[PDB]
Ligand binder design. Structure first.
Ligand SMILES: C[C@@H](N)c1ccc(N2CCOCC2)cc1
Length: 150
């Protein structure tokens, strides 16, 4: 019973979380997942500030109210070569990665690794935080509160 959570640098508190190496998070699971990091889904203003500090990904993820890709450098296979906070407009499907916002993170680029999952609750799952540099932090627990996401 294992969940891998690939996480990024934080930019103005905002970071990206990909579960199990594929788009697999529902909006309800995304809110619960950020809560395990003492975090919330970023507002659009929080994500725009993160972008301005250097944050970009090539993956769709939830923020509060939308699914987006923050882009700095145009790339034909990332948000169709757009820059800025690219907003997904038309999709059939509901599962994406998520972004999270930790208000206690540093104000600008924080590319140290994530070494804790501070607010996970008791549970049976081995949850592994996987950093971009490969360093891992694992803990037994659970973060999902909605049955439909388990
Ligand atoms: C580098 C180390 N002090 C550290 C950095 C970030 C985190 N996380 C906490 C959970 O939410 C995002 C950031 C944990 C520890």
């Amino acid at each position: 019973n294992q969940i891998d959570l690939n996480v990024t640098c934080r930019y103005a508190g905002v970071f990206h979380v990909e579960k199990n190496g594929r788009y697999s998070i529902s909006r309800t699971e995304a809110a619960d997942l950020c809560q395990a990091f003492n975090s919330t889904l970023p507002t659009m203003d929080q994500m725009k500030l993160a972008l301005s500090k250097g944050f970009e990904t090539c993956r769709y993820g939830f923020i509060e109210g939308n699914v987006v890709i923050p882009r700095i450098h145009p790339n034909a296979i990332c948000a169709a070569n757009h820059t800025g906070v690219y907003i997904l407009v038309t999709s059939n499907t509901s599962h994406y990665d998520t972004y999270c916002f930790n208000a206690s993170a540093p104000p600008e680029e924080d590319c140290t690794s994530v070494t804790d999952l501070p607010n996970s609750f008791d549970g049976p799952v081995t949850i592994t935080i996987v950093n971009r540099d490969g360093t891992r932090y694992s803990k037994k627990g659970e973060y999902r509160t909605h049955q439909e996401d388990i």
